Amino acid sequence: SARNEEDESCMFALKLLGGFAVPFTIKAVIELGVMDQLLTAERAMSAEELVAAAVAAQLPRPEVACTMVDRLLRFLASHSVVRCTTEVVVGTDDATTTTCCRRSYAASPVCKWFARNGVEDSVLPLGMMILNKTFLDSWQNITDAVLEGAAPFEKTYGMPMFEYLSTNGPLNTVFHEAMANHSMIITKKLLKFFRGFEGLDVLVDVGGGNGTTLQMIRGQYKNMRGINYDLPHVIAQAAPVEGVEHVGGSMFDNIPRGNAVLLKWILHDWDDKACIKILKNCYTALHVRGKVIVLEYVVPDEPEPTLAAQGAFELDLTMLVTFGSGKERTQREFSELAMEAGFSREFKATYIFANVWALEFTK
Amino acid sequence: SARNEEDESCMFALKLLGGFAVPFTIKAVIELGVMDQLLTAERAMSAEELVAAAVAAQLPRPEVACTMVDRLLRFLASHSVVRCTTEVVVGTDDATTTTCCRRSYAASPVCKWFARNGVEDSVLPLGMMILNKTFLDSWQNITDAVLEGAAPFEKTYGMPMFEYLSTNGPLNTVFHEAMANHSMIITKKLLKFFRGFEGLDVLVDVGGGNGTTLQMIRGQYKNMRGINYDLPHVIAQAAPVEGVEHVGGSMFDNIPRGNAVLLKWILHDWDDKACIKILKNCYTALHVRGKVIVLEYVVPDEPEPTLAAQGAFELDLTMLVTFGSGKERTQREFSELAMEAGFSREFKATYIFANVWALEFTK
Ligand SMILES: NC(=O)c1ccc[n+]([C@@H]2O[C@H](COP(=O)([O-])OP(=O)(O)OC[C@H]3O[C@@H](n4cnc5c(N)ncnc54)[C@H](O)[C@@H]3O)[C@@H](O)[C@H]2O)c1
Ligand SMILES: NC(=O)c1ccc[n+]([C@@H]2O[C@H](COP(=O)([O-])OP(=O)(O)OC[C@H]3O[C@@H](n4cnc5c(N)ncnc54)[C@H](O)[C@@H]3O)[C@@H](O)[C@H]2O)c1
Ligand SMILES: Oc1ccc(/C=C/c2cc(O)cc(O)c2)cc1
Ligand SMILES: Oc1ccc(/C=C/c2cc(O)cc(O)c2)cc1
Ligand SMILES: [Cl-]
Ligand SMILES: [Cl-]
Ligand SMILES: [Cl-]
């Protein structure tokens, strides 16, 4: 009992230190093409069967590849990421790590989110960014960054992340593909569950990229016109989109005038002082009865041990790593920034999807 | 609800991809000195108090340091690693990330396992190895290593781990300190929970280092003599230990004669053929009724979703990453190695601590 408490404590400590193993194993199973074979399978498949289906090339050590994949999948099975069944081996099977016993694996429902197909909703492009080595290396440098009051990313690479992307075309692509993926999913869910675009004549999308988000919204709200507001080098590359003015500039200088401003994953990149500048520009830009629509996660008031709360605090540490002073906020924190920027004590919150809320502040 | 099912599924997918954040956060809290302040505190302490207690040097941006630490500990609290209490701030406090509310933190029981200073009951040296950048970087190269049937470490660094350690003095130290730490903990638990040293006249300790393990065992069993059998260059550096003879040699060539041979975390580094060679050298070194004592994890016959099983399969993946063909084994697998090496069909297993079993095979 006391023996067992000591034992359980030590095992929990080791579990806490080893949490990187699941993500890194999933990454390999995806990259090998094995996850996609699980996703299109009609039945449970052995590691040998999955390797044969995923990998076109002749392998130099095919049995060793098979036994390594078996071990990767066994581990994922113990975490319920895949389903496993075990059958007795008749004869010799060198493609299982256990001579006696052959495992076959099937996808769990969660695995659809790892689809490379793209056809239904997947978060694989976002996951490619989450586990990108460039970004992961920053997490090893938190200590020194904290002692300097700096972003771990900047301590690691010597410049802010957004500048770094200008210097690294491949990472720039990873980052933009991740953002576009998350944006597509959230915009679809917004159109299903959120009613705050009703009645709007003009929506200003800050960071609107090539105008795809506005295009999708305008598709549900045919009367609405859009202002796609983004940096000049972005706006330069945007093709014409029906009903949308592409406008270049900086949101710290000015925001175009409209009936609502959309801020999707913008404010969490910035400290309070910077957020108040943005929101003051929103305030001055809006017409009366106008709204800022903020699409962000919302951290709870206290550190609750729920899946949703842990997710929000994990994004907070991602913002800490990436930006230092970027951060996730509580509902109260968002309201306080809004009030500092001049908005009224009128607050709407609508839950959208995957920890994202739509928060609305009104002039 | 199909909506809520889809939402939970997606959040779960993201949780699975992000599991590295907790280990990296724990590493930073340890490195900063904050964890050791939690361990010695008399009461809950704010991030500001903890940074003041942990960091003697003046910081360039001390308020930013404190808010970052607050965010690291808030995340850990959401994972039950520390306890958190929240009190209303009177005045203005800019060393909490939430200006309304100041959190204070206290160690949970698990935190004692992260203690510095080589203290009683810590796995910190082992943890240093677990989260070492050189060793972690191999986990990014699993896909390509599988395709070649190679160890990820060897794919990453261009040679096996044991060879590479010879060329990297800091990493060699990290490795040996980790092994020594785990050995110390397990040896103390053995002396508490394991019977099998009783009646032994001579115990051979393969990989016995400087003879510390045999020294501890002799502490309890005064009439037992020890042979410390390690690589010649390790033996060269071992100071005399009463009742222990230091002997240099390859365990692949032979093993010194004794009443028992101890193999701790040896077999799991090696494939079946290499294990059978070691155990056959053990068999020749023993007389009838001599024993091999194997200290290893034991993986279950099916991938059970337990804390214990997940820990054993995680070590299996560590072996895959480090050695490729090193692996964790089932009880059946260990029995089948012993019988191949000539041992009798006579098998004892005693659970020790932190997933380690003592398995005994008899000649
Ligand atoms: N970061 C801080 O510590 C902090 C604190 C207070 C205020 N600020 C304000 O933020 C500035 C930092 O930015 P900068 O000087 O490089 O200016 P900038 O206008 O070039 O903006 C830099 C970043 O802002 C974002 N951005 C700007 N306009 C945007 C738009 N229309 N759509 C989408 N994203 C847009 C982009 O991500 C870009 O990389 C400070 O100089 C100050 O004005 C910063
Ligand atoms: N896979 C195998 O069967 C295998 C592997 C390596 C060496 N060997 C044989 O061993 C002989 C010597 O070759 P080598 O010098 O390259 O091997 P070695 O003696 O260096 O042994 C290889 C590894 O075994 C471990 N080791 C060896 N003896 C040990 C001991 N007493 N205590 C703890 N760890 C120990 C070390 O990690 C070492 O790096 C050769 O005959 C070789 O073929 C066989
Ligand atoms: O939780 C844990 C995580 C990792 C480890 C590693 C152990 C280990 C043991 C060896 O003999 C060699 C090695 O290179 C690594 C143990 C426990
Ligand atoms: O589960 C998740 C893990 C990581 C992320 C990262 C989001 C993100 C958002 C930004 O606006 C900028 C950025 O650099 C990163 C989101 C979800
Ligand atoms: Cl092969
Ligand atoms: Cl520009
Ligand atoms: Cl400061």
Author numbering:
A (entry chain B), B (entry chain A): 15 to 377
Text lifted from the article:
Phylogenetic analysis indicates the recruitment of genus-specific SOMTs from canonical caffeic acid O-methyltransferases (COMTs) after the divergence of Sorghum spp. from Saccharum spp. Whilst SbSOMT shows global structural resemblance to SbCOMT, molecular characterizations illustrate two hydrophobic residues (Ile144/Phe337) crucial for substrate binding orientation leading to 3,5-bis-O-methylations in the A-ring.
To rationalize their different catalytic regioselectivities, structural analyses involving X-ray crystallography and computational methods were conducted. We solved the crystal structure of an SbSOMT-resveratrol-nicotinamide adenine dinucleotide (β-NAD) ternary complex (diffracted to 1.72 Å resolution, Fig. 4d; β-NAD was utilized as an additive to improve crystallization), an SbSOMT-resveratrol binary complex, and two ternary complexes reproduced with pinostilbene or pterostilbene (diffracted at 2.10 and 2.56 Å, respectively). All complexes were in high structural resemblance and depicted as a homodimer with an open conformation. The pocket mainly comprised hydrophobic residues, and the stilbene backbone was secured by hydrophobic interactions with Met143, Ile144, Met175, Phe189, Met193, Trp279, Tyr311, Leu329, Met333, Thr336, in addition to Leu28 of the adjacent protomer. Of the three hydroxyl groups on resveratrol capable of forming hydrogen bonds, only the methyl-accepting 3-OH group (A-ring) formed direct hydrogen bonds to SbSOMT residues, including the catalytic residues His282 (2.80 Å) and Asp283 (3.26 Å). Overall, these structures depicted a productive substrate orientation within the substrate binding pocket which greatly favors A-ring O-methylation.
